[PDB]
DNA sequence: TGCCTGGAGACTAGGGAGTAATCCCCTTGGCGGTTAAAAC
DNA sequence: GTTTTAACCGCCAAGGGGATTACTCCCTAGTCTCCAGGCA
């Protein structure tokens, strides 16, 4: 597993922008968005892994991600709790 | 045997709310009317959000409420939008909003 | 026949705002999540629900960030979104 | 199944498949109709 | 095979009270359950903090009323307080 | 060149696999008798 | 020239930039609607002034960033509107 | 013999234990929880106080004033993140 | 400086390990197509 | 508009996890009494 940030695809970022209402997109937006998503995922996943490690588990459950997001201030509905 | 929800006239469980308040470590003691008040407030908020969700569902010629309807209901009502400002609804989408300058 | 620039973009804007489906392929995101997590702790297994929750949160975050970026772009009298727009949105949000 | 290798007359299986049907298809690649020579099948197996 | 307490039946009852014809899906019901749990946690925590500030060892109707006033926006808070006081008055009258 | 870099002998490919030795004998016999051989393997690296 | 000197002077200082008595009057006027005959501790009004001035300085910084992004030195009300809209306080 | 001295700390492990008990955090508080909490609080206090004292030394002063604490918090990135949403009375803001 | 309050000193019941069992469920290399999102 | 390729299904193998629910049981907290010293 290496260089997986390229999995966030240019059409995918374009689709997300279109959902956000963007009409025209510069060519340098894709790298910036990849970096921003990398940072956000790093924070959320670190918190979730801490929660899973506290329970002496080896599987990251959806409840752990929900707790991590709630701690970050981004409470998510529909996945329990 | 008559339930406390029946006495209070509510649909949400007063007994369950009382047990949750006692077991949640909020205070040493929990008053008798606290579960009733909390259940009433929860029922009112559920009624508001469900009324708006059902109104959204009827506009789409659909009988069952899907999460998109709940998202539309929450975001279209300013007070509920403020209440659930930092909340993400799974499979909720976003409101249709295209800025005026972008239109031809 | 050839649509003038901007029309297809608005059409797909309307299409992607009508729907609620996830916009990122699930397997690339699953690999990205596993790649990020292996640094913090090795031999970690992700439930499918956990990956779906992460994807939903990330997509919502990116959509809201793109809304802020588009508002930044309309400010300063533009239509295209540029990296400076994302940077300004993030800085005003309190990130970085 | 569209390959018609009737030119050869010997088949050597370097390793064997778990499914004998796949080996049968590999053999039939050369043993099929219209082939004018005796076909010998050689299977190589590592001892123990 | 274990009990999992949820507000599914109560949310369905309230939905039938509001819209007798409409229904609700599993994801929407999960979202509603999460919403009820979140609002319950908010109000309970605010009430606990209010009790702690005033050096009180109990959560009463006053604490939850103040918590609802603090949390909910204007019209929502006013109607919620009205509903709660109606409920508590009826509960005391029924004894 | 010989004093500058040393490559593994191509002979050691056959020396490291008994299948290759037996196949060398079998293929030499088959070419002597005048046949054509199909070699089937499950792995493409084995093909290399 | 004078603007930069003024920036440095107020940037190094820590005293409250808003006058105390007008702010006390404003606080009491705002509180009048919520409840009648309200008394205020002096520490309460000082805390309100500290919070209000910190909030305004942070907002002005975000609006300056918004103005610079528009290739302008002057701050305009649209900058305040965008700062609050992106921050989420709208 | 004091429990704080037994743990080798300066903060009141006994007071922290009483606060954890009286507070409604849990119905049971372990023996090592107050010790750990006191150690963490003492380390954070020592860090912020060292930074504030360095700021005071840089200003040719002998007392830590709120301005020094503000400068210490805002100059250290980790402490700035920890106290990001915190306003310090009579502290001012960083020079720019 | 005069306290309250944190600290020994004895019981005591239960919360939280250990320890099965027990049920659920894929798990992973290398292969071979084959479309529809990407890429150009 | 034209070309690439990578999600994704299928395979073929032998059993292993790895979270859940019941028993037991034993440290370890809580509760109470008394006291002196830490601190406001």
From Swiss-Prot, chain C:
Residue positions, PTM Phosphothreonine: 42, 69
Residues bearing a lipid moiety (S-palmitoyl cysteine): 72
UniProt superkingdom: Eukaryota
Modified residues (N6-glutaryllysine): 18, 41, 77, 84
GO CC list: nucleoplasm; nucleosome
Residues annotated with N6-acetyllysine modification: 18, 41, 77, 84
Keywords associated with the record: Acetylation, ADP-ribosylation, Chromosome, Citrullination, DNA-binding, Hydroxylation, Lipoprotein, Methylation, Nucleosome core, Nucleus, Palmitate, Phosphoprotein, Ubl conjugation
Modified residues (N6-succinyllysine): 18, 41, 84
Entry keyword annotation includes Lipoprotein: yes
N6-(2-hydroxyisobutyryl)lysine modification, residue list: 18, 26, 41, 84
Modification type N6,N6,N6-trimethyllysine: residues: 18, 41
One Gene Ontology term of the molecular function aspect: protein heterodimerization activity
Subunit architecture: The nucleosome is a histone octamer containing two molecules each of H2A, H2B, H3 and H4 assembled in one H3-H4 heterotetramer and two H2A-H2B heterodimers. The octamer wraps approximately 147 bp of DNA.
The name this protein goes by in its record: Histone H3.2
The species this protein was found in: Xenopus laevis
Full-sequence portion shown in this chain: 40 to 135 of 136
From Swiss-Prot, chain D:
Transmembrane intervals: none
Lineage of the species this protein comes from: Eukaryota, Metazoa, Chordata, Craniata, Vertebrata
Quaternary structure and partners: Interacts with CREBBP and EP300. May be part of a complex containing SRCAP, CREBBP, CARM1 and GRIP1. Component of the chromatin-remodeling SRCAP complex composed of at least SRCAP, DMAP1, RUVBL1, RUVBL2, ACTL6A, YEATS4, VPS72, ACTR6 and ZNHIT1. Component of a NuA4-related complex which contains EP400, TRRAP/PAF400, SRCAP, BRD8/SMAP, EPC1, DMAP1/DNMAP1, RUVBL1/TIP49, RUVBL2, actin, ACTL6A/BAF53A, VPS72 and YEATS4/GAS41. (Microbial infection) Interacts with hepatitis C virus (HCV) NS5A.
Record localization: Nucleus
Function summary: Catalytic component of the SRCAP complex which mediates the ATP-dependent exchange of histone H2AZ/H2B dimers for nucleosomal H2A/H2B, leading to transcriptional regulation of selected genes by chromatin remodeling. Acts as a coactivator for CREB-mediated transcription, steroid receptor-mediated transcription, and Notch-mediated transcription.
Shown segment, full-protein numbering: 2123 to 2170 of 3230
Record-stated family: Belongs to the SNF2/RAD54 helicase family. SWR1 subfamily.
Source domain of life: Eukaryota
Protein name: Helicase SRCAP
UniProtKB/Swiss-Prot annotation, chain E:
Cellular compartments per GO CC: nucleosome; nucleus
Locations listed in the record: Nucleus; Chromosome
Example GO molecular function: DNA binding
Residues joined by cross-link Glycyl lysine isopeptide (Lys-Gly) (interchain with G-Cter in ubiquitin): 90
UniProt KW keywords: Acetylation, Chromosome, DNA-binding, Glycoprotein, Isopeptide bond, Nucleosome core, Nucleus, Phosphoprotein, Ubl conjugation
Main subcellular location of this protein, as a coarse class: nucleus
PTM comment text: Monoubiquitination of Lys-90 by BRE1 gives a specific tag for epigenetic transcriptional activation and is also prerequisite for histone H3 'Lys-4' and 'Lys-79' methylation. GlcNAcylation at Ser-82 promotes monoubiquitination of Lys-90. It fluctuates in response to extracellular glucose, and associates with transcribed genes.
Residues annotated as glycosylated: 82
Protein purpose: Core component of nucleosome. Nucleosomes wrap and compact DNA into chromatin, limiting DNA accessibility to the cellular machineries which require DNA as a template. Histones thereby play a central role in transcription regulation, DNA repair, DNA replication and chromosomal stability. DNA accessibility is regulated via a complex set of post-translational modifications of histones, also called histone code, and nucleosome remodeling.
Quaternary context: The nucleosome is a histone octamer containing two molecules each of H2A, H2B, H3 and H4 assembled in one H3-H4 heterotetramer and two H2A-H2B heterodimers. The octamer wraps approximately 147 bp of DNA.
Recorded family membership: Belongs to the histone H2B family.
The protein's name: Histone H2B 1.1
Parent-protein residues present: 32 to 126 of 126
From Swiss-Prot, chain H:
PTM: Following DNA double-strand breaks (DSBs), it is ubiquitinated through 'Lys-63' linkage of ubiquitin moieties, leading to the recruitment of repair proteins to sites of DNA damage. H2AK119Ub and ionizing radiation-induced 'Lys-63'-linked ubiquitination are distinct events.
Positions of modified residues (N6-succinyllysine): 81
One Gene Ontology cellular component annotation held by this UniProt entry: nucleosome
Residue positions where N6-(2-hydroxyisobutyryl)lysine is found in the record: 22, 60-61, 81
N6-glutaryllysine: residues bearing it: 81
Keywords: Acetylation, Chromosome, DNA-binding, Hydroxylation, Isopeptide bond, Methylation, Nucleosome core, Nucleus, Phosphoprotein, Ubl conjugation
Record localization: Nucleus; Chromosome
Domain of life: Eukaryota
Protein name per its UniProtKB record: Histone H2A type 1
Gene source species: Xenopus laevis
Coverage span on the entire protein: 16 to 111 of 130
């Amino acid at each position: 597993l290496r260089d997986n940030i390229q999995g966030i695809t240019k059409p995918a970022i374009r689709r997300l922008a279109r959902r956000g209402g963007v009409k025209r997109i510069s060519g340098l937006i894709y790298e910036e968005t990849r970096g921003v998503l990398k940072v956000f995922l790093e924070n959320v996943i670190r918190d979730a892994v801490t929660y899973t490690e506290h329970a002496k588990r080896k599987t990251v459950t959806a409840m752990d991600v929900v707790y991590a997001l709630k701690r970050q201030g981004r409470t998510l509905y529909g996945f329990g709790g | 045997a008559k339930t406390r929800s029946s006495r209070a006239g509510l649909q949400f469980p007063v007994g369950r709310v009382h047990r949750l308040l006692r077991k949640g470590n909020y205070a040493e003691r929990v008053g008798a009317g606290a579960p009733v008040y909390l259940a009433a407030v929860l029922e009112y908020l559920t009624a508001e959000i469900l009324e708006l969700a059902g109104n959204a569902a009827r506009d789409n010629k659909k009988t069952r409420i899907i999460p998109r309807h709940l998202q539309l209901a929450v975001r279209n009502d300013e007070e509920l939008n403020k209440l659930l400002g930092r909340v993400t609804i799974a499979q909720g989408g976003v409101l249709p909003n295209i800025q005026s300058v972008l239109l031809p | 026949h050839r649509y003038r620039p901007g029309t297809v973009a608005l059409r797909e804007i309307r299409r992607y705002q009508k729907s609620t489906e996830l916009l990122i392929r699930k397997l690339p995101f699953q690999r990205l999540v596993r790649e990020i997590a292996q640094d913090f702790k090795t031999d970690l297994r992700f439930q499918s629900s956990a990956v779906m929750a992460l994807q939903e949160a990330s997509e919502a975050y990116l959509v809201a960030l793109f809304e802020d970026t588009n508002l930044c772009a309309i400010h300063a009298k533009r239509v295209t979104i540029m990296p400076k727009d994302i940077q300004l949105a993030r800085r005003i949000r309190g990130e970085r | 199944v569209g390959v018609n290798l009737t030119g050869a007359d010997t088949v050597v299986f370097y390793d064997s498949d778990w499914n004998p049907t796949m080996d049968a298809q590999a053999q039939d690649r050369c043993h099929r109709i219209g082939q004018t020579r005796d076909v010998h099948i050689y299977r190589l197996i590592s001892e123990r | 095979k274990t009990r999992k307490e949820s507000y599914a039946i109560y949310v369905y009852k309230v939905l039938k009270q509001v819209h007798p014809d409409t229904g609700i899906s599993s994801k929407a019901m999960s979202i509603m359950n999460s919403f009820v749990n979140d609002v319950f946690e908010r109000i309970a925590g605010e009430a606990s903090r209010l009790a702690h500030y005033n050096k009180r060892s109990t959560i009463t109707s006053r604490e939850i009323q103040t918590a609802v006033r603090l949390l909910l926006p204007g019209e929502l808070a006013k109607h919620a307080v009205s509903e709660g006081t109606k409920a508590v008055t009826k509960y005391t009258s029924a004894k | 060149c010989n004093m500058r870099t040393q490559f593994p002998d191509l002979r050691l490919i056959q020396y490291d696999c008994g299948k290759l030795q037996t196949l060398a004998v079998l293929l030499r016999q088959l070419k002597a008798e005048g046949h054509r051989v199909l070699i089937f393997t499950q792995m493409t690296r084995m093909l290399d």
